[PDB]
Ligand binder design. Structure first.
Ligand SMILES: C[S@@+](CC[C@H](N)C(=O)[O-])C[C@H]1O[C@@H](n2cnc3c(N)ncnc32)[C@H](O)[C@@H]1O
Ligand SMILES: [Mn+2]
Length: 624
């Protein structure tokens, strides 16, 4: 029942992609020559490689195609579905539903209502719902916006149209007397705001042809007034603010812990939210402190000051008003410039070491800064990252470059984070293998697509935790939360990052000489087996470094339809100070990292390798 709303959102993004690919000859091209790499498709259709990569990943996730071992795209039988889509269906992204209701339009939507009644002339249930979403999303939102949700206030023609539609969808019934919204109907109305984020990108999605095959900057160029035209930003902010706020309550346990920590005088004074928006999160945190923490009993003697930072002056004004009766400060700032933030805070006389930094859902929407560490980026290019990211020319940014960009961005933040740490909520993309497997249960198909199309910078959850670990930021175990809770995929993380003295990164082939010399729980591993492990999973073996010195490393195996992660090797160097604590930290990180690893349902070996490091002398490690 709840899978219907998700499928509608899938269709809202997928139908523009499918129709644009169809009209351009993508499916014909992949028929005349059955195995093309991305760049051959780009070349022959004069496409934009970045947006096209977004479209191909979406098509792969819908099982319309797959990639060979050589990364060639091959169509499946499902791809024939593109012929079922009526190509005039794209007109609905431009149809004045506001005028249709109120009856000030020449042409109604009877044709589409009839299409939906016939399930769009296919027995593919998923496909029928994808097509429905193109119609039902704008219609349901306009019906909501005008408080029409019965139809006794519309003209008789309009009433019959929508009564037919609603009755065919199981949304309304009339047994005795008049109409009545069913449970499903009542639920679609009561959840319409969740569709508002996806719906707000209708202008961009209408121009999918331009993104894939034309000049993408025509979609995004802003006028003198600086209004965005790829998205209805005002509706977007309302809708996404409503969705983001659903995760603010997971900060409560973190805030309560922080402001229960004795002694009061050593707790934070300032709580600084980068990208504060309307200040909803700052307001919530202050109320939680006041009601539920030890700090809240002594604010008279030890005041808390809430600080809202935003690069938009109107947001500072709204936040200023929303934080009335709370001691607060509003200042300009940018997620990309923590060093300027620190400078402005010092200018205010704010003691930097007294700051708890916080933010929600902003790192992926930062202005992209290209990597400056060209050497470390090159090392990275051998790893098998699947991050899709698109530049202002519509060209694909190589995954390792997008990752290096995130690492350097977090490094700038890492250099200012205090003992109080960094409260950080973020949303994440998934891989197509996992999106394909959980298409009904997860939002990723449409959400990852419209994020990449609009040149935002999602990464998979494990990539994000790795990027943080590479710069010494570690998500504290007692604060951590991931969603969806019970599926083997992570779209949202709630983190309290603390700064530590060491870093964790992926082991590489270049580390094998150092690794060979470590003490090891299993008998000394030789080079070929290290090579086997690194080759089959280049981004699944973790190592902890301190002041350029290897301290410990954990190798893993991924098995059983890639559902099971298992600990495979445990290496340490016992000449490094505090090595045993550090090695236990690494094992704890591997568990957290494994929990958010796309597609992993369980982790094997934690008990066995925990005992090995905990009772080290009794476990008789080799080469110690
Ligand atoms: C990112 S959404 C709201 C974020 C908010 N923390 C949340 O969880 O919903 C838009 C808000 O973030 C701000 N914002 C967008 N980009 C920013 C940037 N690069 N630096 C600082 N603030 C930014 C916008 O001005 C707007 O107030
Ligand atoms: Mn976003």
């Amino acid at each position: 029942a709840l899978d219907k709303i998700n499928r509608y959102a899938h269709g809202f993004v997928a139908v523009p992609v499918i129709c644009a690919c169809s009209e351009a000859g993508v499916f014909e091209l992949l028929s005349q020559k059955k195995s093309l790499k991305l760049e051959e498709i780009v070349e022959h259709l004069a496409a934009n490689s970045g947006h096209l990569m977004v479209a191909m990943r979406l098509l792969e996730s819908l099982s319309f195609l797959y990639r060979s071992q050589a990364e060639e795209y091959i169509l499946t039988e499902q791809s024939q579905q593109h012929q079922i889509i009526p190509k005039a269906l794209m007109s609905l992204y431009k149809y004045p539903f506001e005028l249709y209701l109120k009856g000030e339009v020449e042409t109604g939507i009877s044709n589409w209502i009839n299409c939906s009644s016939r399930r769009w002339d296919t027995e593919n249930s998923l496909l029928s719902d994808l097509l429905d979403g193109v119609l039902l999303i704008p219609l349901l939102l306009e019906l909501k916006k005008q408080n029409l949700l019965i139809f006794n206030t519309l003209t008789n023609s309009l009433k019959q149209e929508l009564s037919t539609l609603f009755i065919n969808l199981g949304w309304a019934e009339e047994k005795t007397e008049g109409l009545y919204l069913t449970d499903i109907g009542r639920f679609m109305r009561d959840r319409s705001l969740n569709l508002g984020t996806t719906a707000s990108y209708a202008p961009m999605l209408l121009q999918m042809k331009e993104l894939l095959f034309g000049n993408p900057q025509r979609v995004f160029q802003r006028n003198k007034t600086e209004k965005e035209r790829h998205v209805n930003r005002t509706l977007n902010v309302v809708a996404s603010g409503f969705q983001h706020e659903k995760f603010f309550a997971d900060t409560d346990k973190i805030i309560i812990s922080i402001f229960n920590q004795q002694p009061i005088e050593e707790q934070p004074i300032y709580i600084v939210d980068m990208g504060c928006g309307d200040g909803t999160l700052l307001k919530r945190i202050y109320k939680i402190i006041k009601q539920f923490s030890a700090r809240g009993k002594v604010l008279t003697e030890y005041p808390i000051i809430m600080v809202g930072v935003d690069y938009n002056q109107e947001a500072l004004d709204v936040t200023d008003k929303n934080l009335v009766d709370i001691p607060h400060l509003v200042i300009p700032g940018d997620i990309g410039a923590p060093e300027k933030l620190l400078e402005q805070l010092k200018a205010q006389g704010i003691e930097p070491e007294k700051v708890l930094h916080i933010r929600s859902f902003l790192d992926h929407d930062r202005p992209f800064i290209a990597p400056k560490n060209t050497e470390i980026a090159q090392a990275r290019s051998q790893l098998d990252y699947q991050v899709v990211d698109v530049d202002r020319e519509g060209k694909l940014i190589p995954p390792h470059i997008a990752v290096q960009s995130l690492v350097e961005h977090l490094e700038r933040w890492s250099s200012i984070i205090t003992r109080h740490g960094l409260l950080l909520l973020e949303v994440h993309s998934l891989t197509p293998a996992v999106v394909k497997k959980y298409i009904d249960e997860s939002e990723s198909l449409h959400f990852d697509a419209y994020h990449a199309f609009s040149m935002q910078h999602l990464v998979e959850a494990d990539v994000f935790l790795m990027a943080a670990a590479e710069v010494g930021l570690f998500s504290r175990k007692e604060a951590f939360r991931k969603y969806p809770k019970t599926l083997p995929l992570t779209r949202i993380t709630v983190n309290h990052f603390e700064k530590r003295k060491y870093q964790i990164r992926y082991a590489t082939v270049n580390d094998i000489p150092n690794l060979l010399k470590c003490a090891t729980f299993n008998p000394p591993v030789n080079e070929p087996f290290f090579q086997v492990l690194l080759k089959q999973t280049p981004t699944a073996h973790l190592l902890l470094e301190y002041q350029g010195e290897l301290v410990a490393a954990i190798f893993t195996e991924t098995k059983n339809s890639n559902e099971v992660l298992g600990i495979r090797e445990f290496l340490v160097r016992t000449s490094v100070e505090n090595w045993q604590v550090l090695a236990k930290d690494l094992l704890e990180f591997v568990e957290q990292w494994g929990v958010v690893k796309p597609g992993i349902k369980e982790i094997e070996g934690l008990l066995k390798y925990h005992e090995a490091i905990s009772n080290f002398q009794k476990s008789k490690w080799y080469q110690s």
